[PDB]
Scaffold this active site. Sequence first.
Site, PDB file in Angstrom:
ATOM      1  N   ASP D  31       0.765  -1.078  -0.101  1.00 18.98           N
ATOM      2  CA  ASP D  31       0.069  -0.216   0.030  1.00 18.98           C
ATOM      3  C   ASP D  31       0.953   1.214   0.092  1.00 18.98           C
ATOM      4  OD1 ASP D  31      -1.611   2.215   0.863  1.00 18.98           O
ATOM      5  OD2 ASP D  31      -2.740   1.091   2.020  1.00 18.98           O
ATOM      6  N   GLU D 123       1.083   2.000  13.721  1.00 15.04           N
ATOM      7  CA  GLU D 123       0.020   1.925  12.900  1.00 15.04           C
ATOM      8  C   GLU D 123      -1.034   1.055  13.193  1.00 15.04           C
ATOM      9  OE1 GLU D 123      -1.402  -0.421   8.787  1.00 15.04           O
ATOM     10  OE2 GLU D 123       0.919   0.488   8.668  1.00 15.04           O
ATOM     11  N   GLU D 132     -10.056  -4.180  15.321  1.00 16.08           N
ATOM     12  CA  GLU D 132      -8.583  -4.835  15.910  1.00 16.08           C
ATOM     13  C   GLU D 132      -8.468  -4.328  17.524  1.00 16.08           C
ATOM     14  OE1 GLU D 132      -5.596  -5.269  13.213  1.00 16.08           O
ATOM     15  OE2 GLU D 132      -6.795  -4.692  11.583  1.00 16.08           O
ATOM     16  N   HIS D 280      -5.351   0.366   1.533  1.00 21.78           N
ATOM     17  CA  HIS D 280      -5.897  -1.021   1.718  1.00 21.78           C
ATOM     18  C   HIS D 280      -6.935  -0.979   3.004  1.00 21.78           C
ATOM     19  CE1 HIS D 280      -3.104  -0.625   4.960  1.00 21.78           C
ATOM     20  NE2 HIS D 280      -3.576  -1.612   5.424  1.00 21.78           N
TER      21      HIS D 280
HETATM   22  N1  LIG Z   1      -3.705  -2.056   8.312  1.00 20.67           N
HETATM   23  C1  LIG Z   1      -4.660  -2.616   9.317  1.00 20.67           C
HETATM   24  N2  LIG Z   1      -5.794  -3.145   8.680  1.00 20.67           N
HETATM   25  N3  LIG Z   1      -4.410  -2.878  10.727  1.00 20.67           N
HETATM   26  C2  LIG Z   1      -3.249  -2.349  11.352  1.00 20.67           C
HETATM   27  C3  LIG Z   1      -2.377  -3.237  11.727  1.00 20.67           C
HETATM   28  C4  LIG Z   1      -1.013  -3.359  10.907  1.00 20.67           C
HETATM   29  N4  LIG Z   1       0.185  -3.818  11.793  1.00 20.67           N
HETATM   30  C5  LIG Z   1       1.211  -2.887  11.911  1.00 20.67           C
HETATM   31  C6  LIG Z   1       2.406  -3.556  11.058  1.00 20.67           C
HETATM   32  C7  LIG Z   1       3.827  -2.654  11.082  1.00 20.67           C
HETATM   33  N5  LIG Z   1       3.523  -1.456  11.638  1.00 20.67           N
HETATM   34  C8  LIG Z   1       4.127  -2.727   9.804  1.00 20.67           C
HETATM   35  O1  LIG Z   1       4.325  -1.529   9.015  1.00 20.67           O
HETATM   36  O2  LIG Z   1       4.435  -4.043   9.383  1.00 20.67           O
HETATM   37  C9  LIG Z   1      -0.311  -4.298  12.971  1.00 20.67           C
HETATM   38  C10 LIG Z   1       1.135  -5.018  13.783  1.00 20.67           C
HETATM   39  O3  LIG Z   1       0.853  -4.887  15.226  1.00 20.67           O
HETATM   40  C11 LIG Z   1       1.048  -6.378  15.971  1.00 20.67           C
HETATM   41  N6  LIG Z   1       0.437  -6.059  17.232  1.00 20.67           N
HETATM   42  C12 LIG Z   1      -0.985  -5.785  17.375  1.00 20.67           C
HETATM   43  N7  LIG Z   1      -1.396  -5.920  18.519  1.00 20.67           N
HETATM   44  C13 LIG Z   1      -0.154  -5.924  19.244  1.00 20.67           C
HETATM   45  C14 LIG Z   1       0.170  -5.808  20.877  1.00 20.67           C
HETATM   46  N8  LIG Z   1      -0.639  -5.626  21.601  1.00 20.67           N
HETATM   47  N9  LIG Z   1       1.525  -6.077  21.150  1.00 20.67           N
HETATM   48  C15 LIG Z   1       2.384  -6.259  20.315  1.00 20.67           C
HETATM   49  N10 LIG Z   1       1.939  -6.289  18.958  1.00 20.67           N
HETATM   50  C16 LIG Z   1       0.823  -6.354  18.539  1.00 20.67           C
HETATM   51  C17 LIG Z   1       0.242  -7.142  14.976  1.00 20.67           C
HETATM   52  O4  LIG Z   1       0.734  -8.523  15.160  1.00 20.67           O
HETATM   53  C18 LIG Z   1       0.991  -6.710  13.631  1.00 20.67           C
HETATM   54  O5  LIG Z   1       1.957  -7.352  13.487  1.00 20.67           O
END
Ligand SMILES: N=C(N)NCCCN(CC[C@H](N)C(=O)O)C[C@H]1O[C@@H](n2cnc3c(N)ncnc32)[C@H](O)[C@@H]1O
Lengths: 343, 343, 343, 343
Positions: D31, D123, D132, D280
């Site tokens: 994205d 994020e 989430e 996305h």
């Molecule tokens: N885009 C969407 N629809 N939502 C957005 C999600 C995108 N993603 C971010 C990815 C990163 N910035 C990147 O660019 O890769 C969420 C990540 O945060 C972790 N996580 C979620 N609660 C967590 C917790 N309580 N403790 C540790 N880890 C956690 C999840 O396992 C996932 O790896």
Amino acid sequence: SVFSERTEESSAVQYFQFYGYLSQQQNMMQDYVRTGTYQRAILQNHTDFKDKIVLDVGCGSGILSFFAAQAGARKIYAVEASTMAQHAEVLVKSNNLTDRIVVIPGKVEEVSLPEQVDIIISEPMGYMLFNERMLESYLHAKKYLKPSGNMFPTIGDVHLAPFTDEQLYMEQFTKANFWYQPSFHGVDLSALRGAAVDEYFRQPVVDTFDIRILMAKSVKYTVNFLEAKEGDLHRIEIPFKFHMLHSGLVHGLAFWFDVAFIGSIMTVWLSTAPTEPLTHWYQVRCLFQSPLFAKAGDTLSGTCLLIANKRQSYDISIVAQVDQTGSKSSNLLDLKNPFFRYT
Amino acid sequence: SVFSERTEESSAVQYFQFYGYLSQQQNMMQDYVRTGTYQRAILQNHTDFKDKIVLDVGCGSGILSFFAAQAGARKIYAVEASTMAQHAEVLVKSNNLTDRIVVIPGKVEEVSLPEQVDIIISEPMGYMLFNERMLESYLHAKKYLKPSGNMFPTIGDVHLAPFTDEQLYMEQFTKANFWYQPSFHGVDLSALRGAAVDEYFRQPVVDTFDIRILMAKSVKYTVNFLEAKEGDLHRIEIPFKFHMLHSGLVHGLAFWFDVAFIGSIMTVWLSTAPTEPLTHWYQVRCLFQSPLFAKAGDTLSGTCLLIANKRQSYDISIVAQVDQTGSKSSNLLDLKNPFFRYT
Amino acid sequence: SVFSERTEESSAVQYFQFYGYLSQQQNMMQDYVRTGTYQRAILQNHTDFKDKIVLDVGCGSGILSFFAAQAGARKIYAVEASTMAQHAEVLVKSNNLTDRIVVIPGKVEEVSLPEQVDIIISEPMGYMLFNERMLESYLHAKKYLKPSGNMFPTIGDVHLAPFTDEQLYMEQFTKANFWYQPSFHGVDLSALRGAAVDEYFRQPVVDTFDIRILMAKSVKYTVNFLEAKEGDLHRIEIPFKFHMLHSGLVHGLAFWFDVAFIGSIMTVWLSTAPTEPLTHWYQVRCLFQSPLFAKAGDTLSGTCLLIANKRQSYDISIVAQVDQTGSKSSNLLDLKNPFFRYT
Amino acid sequence: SVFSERTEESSAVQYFQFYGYLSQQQNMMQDYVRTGTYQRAILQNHTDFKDKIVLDVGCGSGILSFFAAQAGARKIYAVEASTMAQHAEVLVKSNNLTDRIVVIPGKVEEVSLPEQVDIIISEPMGYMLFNERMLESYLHAKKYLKPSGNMFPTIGDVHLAPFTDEQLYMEQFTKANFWYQPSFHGVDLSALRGAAVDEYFRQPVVDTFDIRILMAKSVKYTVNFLEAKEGDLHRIEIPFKFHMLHSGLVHGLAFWFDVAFIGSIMTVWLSTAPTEPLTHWYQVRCLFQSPLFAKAGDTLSGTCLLIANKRQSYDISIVAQVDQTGSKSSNLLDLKNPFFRYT
Ligand SMILES: N=C(N)NCCCN(CC[C@H](N)C(=O)O)C[C@H]1O[C@@H](n2cnc3c(N)ncnc32)[C@H](O)[C@@H]1O
Ligand SMILES: N=C(N)NCCCN(CC[C@H](N)C(=O)O)C[C@H]1O[C@@H](n2cnc3c(N)ncnc32)[C@H](O)[C@@H]1O
Ligand SMILES: N=C(N)NCCCN(CC[C@H](N)C(=O)O)C[C@H]1O[C@@H](n2cnc3c(N)ncnc32)[C@H](O)[C@@H]1O
Ligand SMILES: N=C(N)NCCCN(CC[C@H](N)C(=O)O)C[C@H]1O[C@@H](n2cnc3c(N)ncnc32)[C@H](O)[C@@H]1O
């Protein structure tokens, strides 16, 4: 001749076959910014033409020579090396101008003119200004120019500026990674992945872009056609120091150019800048193999060295460093083989 | 050499420069109909390769030689005149086939092979089958073929059929009408109108089309590569008689080709027909400057004559007439300078 | 329970939430091959149902139980562990069948039935037959089956066959090579390329295909539901020896399955073979990490070992070799995480 | 832990299993609006990172932590609960940033950090911003933020506006009408009609749309991440009053969101509005089971209430009325089970 000495025959044949097509002449003629600006530069400076002797270097269809005649020129020698000369001769006759326009088939380095001229007109600009090496033919023609004669165009400005374009950069790997597969119909292609990446990065990219990808004010390199010698264009060294206006990754250098017709009445500019309407020259980007991180306020310094080759083009060497971090990048490009990306 | 005697140096340099680029190899390799069909022809006829000696004429990246190695060939001489030969060597080494695939750099007309071969493999087909004149190199290579040897492909079928396409016709005519103008920036271009129409209509059109534009069943001209001599391809005369299935304007002739790999186990066909999935050969159409009107039931007869030239291509003359009315069209095309219309 | 002991709670929750949606029940109900064949198997074997006691294992909406009632069953116990049980109960009442159908909410491993039954009906098949491990619940239910009671379906046949699909194979690298770039927004991703390739190849591919990609007659592994025990499905070893009908590269093994309802009047088959109309099971392909070259007449031998896991699925191990060459390939796949490729 | 107390284990296992896959990371990373905007927010505010301590909450592949390292951060703690943590470590090592990026595997609610941080980056946005419940983790992480610390993103704006889309409405209704049938293979399904309509209309629709379906200017609900507490997000009440700009059927409410990175140098916005390039996150629409008729000039008032649940999502109630007529609609949606309609 000076021409045959700096040009491989194979390149010359292809080059003049290309300009022998009416469709190519037509493509240039229909570039309105180009054609219209030449006509304006000539007509609005009519005192540089009225009852004067003119040389048209590489006249193609003859269009610039007709503009010189519209401005009142006494005599125009229109020199053209491709078979387009025959079509130009057809037009001088059908436009009742045989008394004023003399078509001379041949290379300007090889033909003889019967007298000296007051002004030379030409459109010798290629991509990045210098591609095709026709500027050397234009400069060469000054052997026929009277002292204090004039040149239209009079000067050429090449502009260079750093740009960021993550998608353009990533595209090269997307393409090269075709080779990064272990069983293409049973064949492991992966050993050629590096060579494919190198090949893609050696190609300057011809297309246009949004001006917001530019990360600093351009640096300008000027050729004064009244003063320059042919030999000056064999090795072109363009130092640069960019003062970064935006923070980010620098993926390469963008190029464009302006020319100016400095006449007695006024100066008229033809610009291929990304801030101006598009021309058939587009703009040109040379990628760095490794992008450079810079902050707003950092300085990006280095040199763009253009080395003329016998394929009527240049080997481009770009070296750049971010002075505050010492991070450095290089690239070697072949201007003869650009990638036409525009859609 | 036989190659240099029939080929202008300028054409040859450009030709082999083009095939030295990995991006061009990638484009060909990604034609899956082509690559997959070659692989099937070879692997499904593995007994024609098993423990045999193979010559791959113009091996490029080496892909067909790898298919021959997959089928069990004892020794494969992979001849290639461009710098791609060096990339092939790299793949032969990284795929651990140094004992079986031997790259021999050079023109097949000029190199020395160590022994005679059981089978020759190649992809010598260009636009309209004959563009690039590589079929002559393919036939020339038979000097190395054992008396009972085979050729893959074994035969080539050229198909031609009349078509109607007013829009394509008008599209080209519109481009030529630029030269009709009596006052382009004040300049009368019209004396070049005829020359412009000739030039545009001299370009074969490369792209695909709906089979419903075809107005008669195709006529087929077959070249048997086991039997033909090089000299046979200097002058190719294709007579034709079409029984028109539809009434209308015939705007020209459409061309495509099939080749057959006639192996000991089975015959495998590679087709570029507009009834088949598209290939990178597309199809080719030669326009008439003036379309011929025909009714369903009429016969359209004449000849397509291809005369080989030294730019590794053909000068095409197509003469066609509607037998019932005497309406005749004569046209000349330059197969070397096609209009790539597909987008 | 036997169920909680072989199933992680997290998997069970998700599984029964999935079957709790009316839309999912609807998706299965609208698979006409499935629903219509169950109805036919039951109605055309009415003597296996008329005035009999029936158990419906995992009744969902209750649809199969209604078919058993259409066939004249005296009493049907419809067991269902998701919240769909509540909707089934609503339908038994609205269809005036409370005297004949008894909905029992709960897992068949955990509920009690009031009496033994003459016949068990169920639709416990997943992808590759065994996915979801619902066949073990179906077998488990035989504790309620009278001696010489029957099972609908009675047997299940899994078919395996080698296939060639160069494009499917190459797609995995095209996807994984996203990571093979040295400067994704300044980050070198390349160290994860191998892990990405591994991840893609661990996923069985759910979609359909042309039967011409199959390179040998299928091998069949049969589960007789009348005879099998639950424990028989914890480790499933499927030896194979394929006699290659076509020469080429083998990229993996394709899977499909049939079940048969062996009734007193007739046997009715439900097939998900690529020669039959599509069902919501599609077919499943497991790729080899390295494709295998085989000639027509060669034999490809090895084993497909399915090891049940507590996520209601199987770890798949496939090992294969071409006996004539000794060339070998492996793969480990996770049936719980298939790639749904169908479009 | 705060995480486990608000989260069912079944939901959490699935949640972190999903984010452990490299294919999912690839989808997010590709994205370009998202990734490029994050990179700009960080690099253009490099002074907020230079020689600072950073916490990256849910670092995934590590990309934001690499952006923080590019901006000059002294030390970055990259917290990640999925097995992706192991892939991040690999990239940190292969990018030679072991001295600066420290991956800490585990839930941010459960791990121990070595020191307080200057800035938190994350994020945490899901569908409709709040899906989430990762925003709560983001806020929870403020226990590690120095008193004068910053949050990137700093604020989040949810936008809601009424829309008209008869086709979407009918599309869902059509799916529900399956359960209307009085004789599906002889079975009366109709008693489940109401339950089916409820279930289908309970699904928020994720896709994009033309802005011309929007019938009033959006209403904005702002969450300030510097100020908000975790507990604030357990119950989110969004009152609204729309001044209808067009007459027609209101079929539901459309939702999107913006976040702002409020840095010391500039504020950078990431928008998922239907007026902006697609991301996305697409947009989200909640349908009414019965659309409301409104005229231009009327007011549509009510409340959107989001109640957090233990499946890491929200139960949504939307109550809306046309003030001029008293026409009222009440609807319940399950944000966890959306209909992904975009193709
Ligand atoms: N885009 C969407 N629809 N939502 C957005 C999600 C995108 N993603 C971010 C990815 C990163 N910035 C990147 O660019 O890769 C969420 C990540 O945060 C972790 N996580 C979620 N609660 C967590 C917790 N309580 N403790 C540790 N880890 C956690 C999840 O396992 C996932 O790896
Ligand atoms: N636009 C671009 N990219 N390049 C430049 C525009 C092309 N073209 C312009 C045509 C016309 N004046 C016009 O303005 O329309 C240059 C012509 O100069 C001739 N030539 C090149 N070296 C020559 C030589 N050494 N001796 C004689 N002729 C020569 C070529 O055959 C060609 O016809
Ligand atoms: N597809 C089209 N339109 N035309 C078909 C061309 C495809 N291409 C085949 C590629 C190869 N089979 C592959 O799959 O890669 C032609 C190659 O043959 C070489 N060659 C041409 N005359 C040669 C000669 N006289 N002596 C040695 N080499 C020669 C060229 O340099 C080029 O590398
Ligand atoms: N088609 C596929 N891929 N798989 C199979 C079709 C799905 N489905 C079919 C529904 C219906 N008979 C029909 O033919 O329509 C199986 C149902 O069995 C229940 N179940 C699974 N283990 C269960 C257990 N241990 N105890 C009670 N119930 C159980 C599940 O909740 C689910 O509702």
